[PDB]
Amino acid sequence: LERSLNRVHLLGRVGQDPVLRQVEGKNPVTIFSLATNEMWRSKTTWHRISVFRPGLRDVAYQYVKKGSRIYLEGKIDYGEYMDKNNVRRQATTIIADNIIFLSD
Template sequence: MLRRPLQQVFRQFVRYESESTMPLVLERSLNRIQLLGRVGQDPVMRQVEGKNPVTIFSLATNEMWRSGDSEVFQGDDITQKTTWHRISVFRPGLRDVAYQYVKKGARIYVEGKIDYGEYMDKNNVRRQATTVIADNIIFLSDNMKEKE
C-alpha cells in the first residue's frame, strides 16, 4: 500500500538512467533566495562582447537585534548589521524594467538564485564574487523622498 506512492515520489526525483553499469541519477535541487531591502545605487547596464547585457545594482538588507540584557527597552540596546548584495538581472524584459525603474533608495523585493563565480581583477588577481541572479522584482515603494 505504501510502496506505490513512494515509487511515484521517487520517479519525480529520478530524471535519467544511463545504460552503463552505474545508473546516473539526477536529483532535483533548489537554489532560491528572497531579499527585501533598499537599493544602494542606481542600476548600470553592462554588456560583454558576445554575451547578453545585464543590469546590475546593489541591495542592502538589515538585521537588528537587542544587545542588552535589560527587561526595560532602551534605544541603545538595538544593534543593526547591514549586508550588501550584488543583484544581476539577465532576463530581457525584467532587465530593461530594472534598468529603467529601479532607483537608489527604492524599497524592493527580489527573488532569484545565488551564483558564486570568479574573475580576474585589473591586477590579474583572482577574486571571488557572490551574485544574486534575479528572476523577479517587486517594487514596494517609490524612491525615498528627499527632505526639503
C-alpha cells in the same frame, strides 16, 4: 538528472542607481546594489544583483532607483574568476528572477 533548490529572497533598500553592463561580447545585464539589515541585539549586508532576463532587465533599469524599497527573488552565483590570473577569487551576485517594485 535530479533536482535542487537555490533561492534567495531579499527585501531591502536599493543603494545605487542601476548600471547597464555587458557580460562577454553579447550578454546584457543590469546590475544594482541592495542593502539588507541584520537587526541584532547586544549591521548592513550589501548584495550585488544581476538581472540577465530579456524583459525584466529593461524594466529594473528604468524603475530601480537608489533608496527604492524592493522585494526580490533569485539564485546565488558565486562568480569565481582568477584575479590577475593568480588568486582564485569569487564575485557573488544574486541573479534575479522576480522583482516586485514596492515604492510607486
